[PDB]
């Protein structure tokens, strides 16, 4: 069994999950992954632009 933290709200809190099937496509959906990386739609430029400097020197 895998024991994982619940969605907790800010100011027990565990839940147990056991996978019962032989395929990994039968597992319940991920919803605990909150990873991001904005800087490739937001700052796709080749040379770094520093915020405090003018963009075009």
């Amino acid at each position: 069994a895998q024991v994982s933290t619940q969605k907790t709200g800010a100011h027990i809190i565990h839940y147990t999950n056991i996978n019962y099937y032989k395929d990994a496509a039968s597992n319940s959906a991920n919803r605990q992954d909150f990873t991001q990386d904005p800087s490739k739609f937001t700052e796709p430029v080749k040379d770094v632009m520093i915020k405090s400097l003018p963009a075009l020197n």
Partner: peptide, 11 residues
């Protein structure tokens, strides 16, 4: 979200 049996085992 609950688990449900696969419709093609060992795919």
């Amino acid at each position: 979200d609950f688990q449900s049996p696969s419709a093609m085992p060992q795919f």
